[PDB]
Each structure stands twice: as C-alpha cells, then as structure tokens.
Amino acid sequence: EQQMHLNVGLRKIKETVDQVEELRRDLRIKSQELEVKNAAANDKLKKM
Amino acid sequence: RDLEASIARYKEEYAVLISEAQAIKADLAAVEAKVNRSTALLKSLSAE
C-alpha cells in the first residue's frame, strides 16, 4: 500500500511539475516579451 | 507660446510614457518574481 501510494504520489508530482513548467515557461516568455517591450518604450521615450 | 504649448504637450506625453513604462515594469517584476520563483519551485519539486 505504501509503495503504491508513493508511486501514485510520484505520478501526481510529475503531473504537477508538468502543470507548473507549462505556467513557468509561459510566465518567463511573457516576462521576456514585456521586458523587451518595456526596453523599446524606454528608448522611444528617451528619444522623444 | 506655440513652442511652450508643444513643450508642455511633449512633457505630458513623456510623463504618460513614463507612467505606462512603470506599469509595464511592475507587471514585468511580478512576471519575473514569478519566473525566478517558478524555476526555483521546480528545483524544489525535482528534489522532492
């Protein structure tokens, strides 16, 4: 029973790792896109 | 008077461009705090 639970628990932990990595990768990509857009608006604002 | 009005309009556009940048920066700092903590969270999940 304990080994099955631990194995079932590892399966669920891998599932949660898949959920967070999908959120993180998309969170990191959005953060990088927002930083480049912020850096662009800063350069245009400095030129103006 | 026309040049003073153009300077005031440009200064208003810059204060608007700076306020928009600060919202983009705080949004980016939240999205990064999320990125860094989500990478480090995953480092924890894998250790577990």
Number of A to B CB contacts under 8 A, please give it. 56
Residue of B28, B35, B39 lying closest to A38 (CB–CB): B28
Residue of B28, B42, B48 lying closest to A24 (CB–CB): B42
Terminal C-alpha separation, chain A: 69
On the CB side of A27, CA atoms within 13 Å amount to 18
Burial class (CB in 10 A: 0-12, 13-18, 19+), A19: exposed
**Technique used:** cryo-EM
The Cα diameter of chain B in Å comes to 69
Closest CA–CA distance from residue B45 to any residue of chain A (Å): 7
Dihedral sign for Cα A36, A40, A46, B3, please. Answer: negative
Burial class (CB in 10 A: 0-12, 13-18, 19+), A12: exposed
